[PDB]
Design a protein around this ligand. Structure first.
Ligand SMILES: COc1ccc(Cl)cc1C(=O)NCCc1ccc(S(=O)(=O)Nc2nnc(C(C)C)s2)cc1
Ligand SMILES: COc1ccc(Cl)cc1C(=O)NCCc1ccc(S(=O)(=O)Nc2nnc(C(C)C)s2)cc1
Length: 263
């Protein structure tokens, strides 16, 4: 009863904080939705940059690989900010000690970003420019190493994740559970974190029961994906650290350096 209303509240805050929903993404990738402009090479990328409207700008005078790397960074930073406002809409999150709130966001944001990233990806590429662009996976592998390497595993994770067929209402709860994880390092009051988590997790288990009646082992399967995202994020961080040391003409945004750093 209260769980059902809890889940609805989390879902609304998710809808309030993130513009691209899985529902919208899927109705675009599948086809009242015009087909997105396909970015498959440098020319189409340049045209997409000139023609489409994006949320922002980037450093000028950069080779393509690096330029695309900064676009992604800029998008990551914006989602970190959306996730920060969303976690503030999670009942009690704002009750935690300041250090804990920070610690949860620091260690959980990329996990949430990668779970949500799947909504806009298929095996062939992903939506960009808020759904008006579609960048092909082949075009991305055609970029310079090590930049062509960052994304492949996100694609691998996404295609497996998408087979679970979650919808926005499931994802909103999944994302709160990821942020309210009691296993982060340096947590001060973990019992207080796990108390808020258990509520979200109870709301989720029940929610999936209602929303996926003919899917028996979905709940635990979801908790396992959380394990997958954590490994995905550890790898991603190492990739960034190496690019940082290996690519002198590139730099990590301040807020992102502060995240990849400690982890
Ligand atoms: C691959 O993403 C893009 C590729 C080309 C163009 Cl024109 C735009 C985007 C974009 O807007 N991405 C925003 C969403 C996004 C953000 C981060 C990531 S990532 O976590 O994989 N980090 C990456 N950093 N650089 C990357 C490039 C060099 C592939 S991937 C993937 C996707
Ligand atoms: C902004 O954070 C700081 C603010 C004052 C001082 Cl004395 C130090 C830091 C710092 O070392 N933060 C490192 C971690 C961090 C860096 C940047 C960002 S942000 O860019 O997302 N927010 C900012 N807003 N304004 C900023 C500049 C103009 C100070 S940074 C978040 C987190």
């Amino acid at each position: 009863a209260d769980l059902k209303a809890f889940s609805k509240h989390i879902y609304n805050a998710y809808l309030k904080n993130f513009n691209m929903t899985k529902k919208k993404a899927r109705s675009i990738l599948t086809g009242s939705h015009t087909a997105p402009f396909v970015i498959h090479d440098i020319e189409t990328l340049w045209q997409a940059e000139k023609g489409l409207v994006w949320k922002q700008g980037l450093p000028p005078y950069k080779e393509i690989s690096v330029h695309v790397f900064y676009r992604c960074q800029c998008t990551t930073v914006e989602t970190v900010r959306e996730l920060t406002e969303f976690a503030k809409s999670i009942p009690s999150f704002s009750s935690l000690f300041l250090n804990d709130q920070v610690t949860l966001l620091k260690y959980g944001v990329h996990e949430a970003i990668f779970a949500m990233l799947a909504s806009i990806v298929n095996k062939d590429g992903l939506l960009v420019a808020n759904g008006s662009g579609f960048v092909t996976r082949e075009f991305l592998r055609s970029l310079r190493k090590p930049f062509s390497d960052i994304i492949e595993p996100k694609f691998e994770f996404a295609v497996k994740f998408n087979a679970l067929e979650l919808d926005d209402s499931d994802l909103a709860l999944f994302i709160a559970a990821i942020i309210l994880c009691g296993d982060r390092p340096g947590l001060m009051n973990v019992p207080r974190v796990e108390a808020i988590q258990d509520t979200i997790l109870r709301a989720l288990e029940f929610h999936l029961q209602a929303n996926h009646p003919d899917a028996q082992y979905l709940f635990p399967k979801l908790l396992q994906k959380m394990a997958d995202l954590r490994q995905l994020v550890t790898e991603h961080a190492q990739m960034m650290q190496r690019i940082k040391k290996t690519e002198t003409e590139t730099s990590l945004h301040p807020l992102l350096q502060e995240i990849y750093k400690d982890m």
